[PDB]
DNA sequence: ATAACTTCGTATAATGTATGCTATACGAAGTTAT
DNA sequence: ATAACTTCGTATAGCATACATTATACGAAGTTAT
DNA sequence: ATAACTTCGTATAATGTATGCTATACGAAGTTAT
DNA sequence: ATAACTTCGTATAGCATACATTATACGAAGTTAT
């Protein structure tokens, strides 16, 4: 068909409308699908309903998680929807196939993870164990894990800080305002305060690594093995060496993670963030208040992070 | 005819789509359906709108509360959609006769119902009837309630708990522990980690553990039911929630949670809920929810 | 057309699905409608756009207030919309006319009215006179007015209570549920709690009327000429009899009104509202609550009803 | 083509349904659109989507923010709907370009503006500068001042005040009413109730006060400016608010109102919102809005 | 030679909610050991 | 017979997941100034 | 005979919000009295 | 010439009203136990 043939010129001549993440998920699923086609001598595109059935069966065989499988549905319910076509999921093979796998991992004890917490205590422990170093890593890695902390930022967020978008407060308070985030993208975005001590950390990081040369560098960059910054306002620190800091900054307290080869053994990305909300809760903060420090525009996710009557039981 | 046969095929294929006690639902409202439109002369199947109404209107006159014709009606969508069929909800007919059907019961004053509150004045009531006896149902029923209480965990979730999963239940207080200990005791349930906490006591008064089969959801309601039967006897005089039942702990365990006063995000994170809906209305008619006016005029 | 009169033999057939008083608007605008077209030698169904259009212009001629206008309107495309047929609305030469008629009318300084308030002082004043009232009609007018102030409820809903919808509180205070609102039509419905003051009056109320003889009895009734209450279950005090003690009260504290003609000379269904609304603000009630109080799902006609920086501006 | 010269023509007689400021933009929109058509070979209309896409795609370069391109798609779907065309917004393509349009610009760098607070600092300031000065503009432009901070009225809202109207404005400070009476002294205003408060002022230093003709909101804007100016000397060196402007008084007036503590509420009737977003905005970098983390690091 | 990355691919969490699904209710028929 | 349940059917109260992306999680392989 | 209604018809308020409409911004061309 | 504006065009920030009912507002005419 032609029409489906430039609905996808045009999804992909666009695709700029799209995160590079939506772009990164569509390839990968599509070769793994492609793969299961190719085995069974199956069409691959308009795909067909028994066939998408079979594919996610086959997945759940593979003990992939239940939001897995979601996402491969997902993916091809995208390009067959913006190609024109029917998705798989508008028939019930899919439909149901897709709760039966849910309900089954579900009922037989499968679960989504979360990052392990990093909490007030955490940030203090560590704080008062590299605030004496005099490596420019060291007060580069203190000064994130501090924003992580302090503004609940996504990584992608924090890597995407240029000097520029640092203002300041009247009483001295660093703010960082942020465009993108995953739920929002404006041009008047947010902005997120600093406290004290968090700004305090910052400051010596640009003082050390010289970031503020260009107002267009991004605040962190990559530090070599002797100690010298390289400001870059072209190619920003990596989420993965972000998410490497958070795995360093563990193993320098806690040692080396089990080889069980579970996810979570160490602090990660979102380890900041679900810990942030644990530590308010805690603190009696309100719900509402709680929302709006991570971004939150509704509660759910916030309850799983946050979770004795026996206080009431007794006299 | 196909594209349903093999929809209905779909269905039986992927049962496992839905839990049984939805096929149960379904089965009972097409029985239903079926029966009135034998008895009515019209064909059951696919469901045309003015007989849908037809019968909506007639669950409306024998007496069902709005939600149960919903409930009809729900199943009726969900048996077309997954055959190729429209959905009766979605004709002009039966939108308008739901709006009627339910503006129209409630105002002749049809009300949802709830739980009678089993409170901390009732459950050390109950203690001491039976405290100081030594048959083992007394025993184990002291512990049921105190869990209920303490945990406001529903009956299904109750029904599953096994020993190995213990106090804390994957917490408890300090004389719910003890009395749950008394009845494990007096069980044996510690016997087999894999055995459930609470089983069957026979006529004899001999308890019988095991891990293939557990206490129903209904004999748990009917230790509620006989607790309440053994203090104000014999049922009220033919409606629902005249006793005691599941629910009937959680309800209670939140108004007095309320009562002495915290946080309502507490409440909730202690049932498990998290859409204050239903933990506002349990708590309600308490007078510190009387709001801004009272607390005005009272000055 | 079959598909019309089917379609509109379906809307009649189950009119309960409406309010009766979108009932009587519906005809009251056809009447209107239908007036017109006669005058001008037009047909009246399938309503013509350039009719339409005229007619709404001969209503803005007329005087007529705005929102009197977009009733008329709004009727018109309920009829063709459920109907089957367009709606007047759906063409360009009546939606245009729509706003070209409401910002010509506002430009020329129309303006919608509120009620006027009923607050604190009035009840406490009102309150004082006719507590010491023996006759049977004072301690009802005071027991309703109290109510309709405590509770923000409209006067429908006031009429539509019965003895048998009134529980308690440990503490002794009425609590009223109430099924049916103008936001809301569901069998959990809302309660209502009333001031151990508001209790008292609707006590002596029931006590000296008998409304309590039958569960089913309507809590407020008739009472004629020899100050002898007349309880029923099934025929109700009317909303307009309900005015009507707004409006004496007003008369006994302030006298007789204006011959002007205008609307809310004197208190009304809906000054209770209006004035607990204020009261609540004043008091630094926080605007979530006052949104509770008096139903509203919603900020702005709280803001409306709640309408010196100078304070600022001296050293 | 009959039923878009009929839709046309509806549009030019009901005219009225919109303000004369809408269809200045519309014009300016259609003109803009029209000359690019030319340019580049395309029929302006009925605008076709591969056209309205690659136009949109043609703002981008020329450097213009989302919201700017967001007006001028808006303008050419009022002009379709109001014809009986298709809207080129929902075209698949144009849908496809504004999505990465937005995000593209954002990624960037591209931020929403606001007006450079005109607070207490300087409203004391100008005072200081100008208290003592005997020019009629000068006692013009306190009075001016004075209201726009006090009141937050917007300029359009200050051109078209009367003296009649007047102390209460159908509420201001002390010394801000006794500023307004000097320049009513020396402008002479009073002498007509419908003339506008505020009038010319010519070069020779009289003030002509008039009922017909209204100070223009660019004169008022001028009053900011030339105040920015008057202080610290010409314009910063080409882009947007590096001078105070018609709402400058508007934010800082809140900036204060907050800084000094009062409910946000509060601060909204006395602007006029019902949408905090805005207010919000405003104040947002302020140490009393710093958030409940700030507060918890700090302790 | 190696610290400290980057880039990459499969894997999986997260982002809000309305009404479609799944619970409890409870009279009562059926079942089994005492 | 019957206590003390289980299974059932159908009433009614009460949760949680399908939807369309966009983000992180983490081992591994390639990179580059020391 | 009349208080205290009821019923009724025209008239109009109210009920929530998203993005379509209407504001301000500001360089600059045009205008008029000094 | 030029101060001190107004009119303009096009940029960008910021409100408010169309949508589908459902309710009240209030004079007037009919009603009914005193």
Redesign the pocket.
């Known amino acids: 068909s032609d029409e489906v043939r430039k609905n996808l010129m045009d999804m992909f001549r666009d695709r700029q409308?799209?995160?590079?993440?939506?772009?990164?998920?569509?390839?990968?699923?599509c070769?793994?699908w492609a793969?299961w086609c190719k085995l069974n001598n199956r069409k691959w595109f308009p795909a067909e309903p028994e066939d998408v059935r079979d594919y996610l069966l086959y997945?759940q065989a593979?003990?992939?998680?239940?939001?897995?499988?979601?996402?491969?549905?997902?993916?091809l319910?995208?390009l067959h929807?913006?190609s024109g076509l029917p998705?798989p999921?508008?028939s019930n093979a899919?439909?149901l196939v897709?709760?039966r796998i849910?309900?089954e991992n579900?009922d037989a004890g499968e679960?989504?993870?979360?990052?392990?917490a990093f909490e007030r205590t955490d940030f203090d422990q560590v704080r008062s164990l590299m605030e004496n170093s005099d490596?420019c890593?060291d007060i580069?890695?203190l000064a994130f894990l501090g924003i992580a902390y302090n503004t609940l930022?996504?990584?992608?967020?924090?890597?995407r800080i240029r000097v520029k978008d640092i203002s300041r407060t009247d009483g001295g308070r660093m703010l960082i305002h942020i465009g993108?985030?995953?739920?929002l993208?404006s041009?008047?975005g947010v902005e997120k305060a600093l406290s004290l001590g968090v700004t305090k950390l910052v400051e010596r990081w640009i003082s050390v690594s010289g970031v503020a040369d260009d107002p267009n560098n991004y605040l962190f960059?990559?530090?070599?093995?002797?100690?010298?910054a390289?400001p870059?306002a072209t190619?920003?620190?990596?989420?993965?060496?972000?998410?490497?800091?958070?795995?360093?900054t563990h193993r320098l307290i806690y040692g080396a993670?089990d080889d069980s080869?579970?996810?979570?053994?160490?602090?990660?990305?979102?380890?900041a963030?679900?810990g942030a909300a644990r530590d308010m809760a805690r603190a009696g903060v309100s719900i509402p208040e709680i929302?709006q420090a991570?971004?939150?525009?509704?509660?759910?996710?916030?309850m799983?992070?946050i979770r004795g009557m026996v206080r009431l039981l007794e006299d």
């Open positions: 409308a799209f995160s590079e993440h939506t772009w990164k998920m569509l390839l990968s699923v070769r793994s793969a997945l593979r003990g992939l998680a239940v939001k897995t499988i979601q996402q491969h549905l997902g993916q319910n995208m929807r913006r998705r999921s508008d899919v439909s897709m709760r849910r309900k579900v679960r989504a993870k979360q990052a392990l490596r890593q580069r890695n930022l996504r990584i992608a967020e924090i890597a993108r985030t995953k739920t993208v041009t008047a960059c990559r530090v070599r093995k002797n100690g010298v390289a870059s190619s920003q620190l990596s989420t993965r060496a972000l998410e490497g800091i958070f795995e360093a993670k080869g579970q996810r979570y053994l160490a602090w990660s990305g979102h380890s963030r679900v929302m991570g971004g939150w525009t509704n509660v759910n996710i916030v799983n992070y």
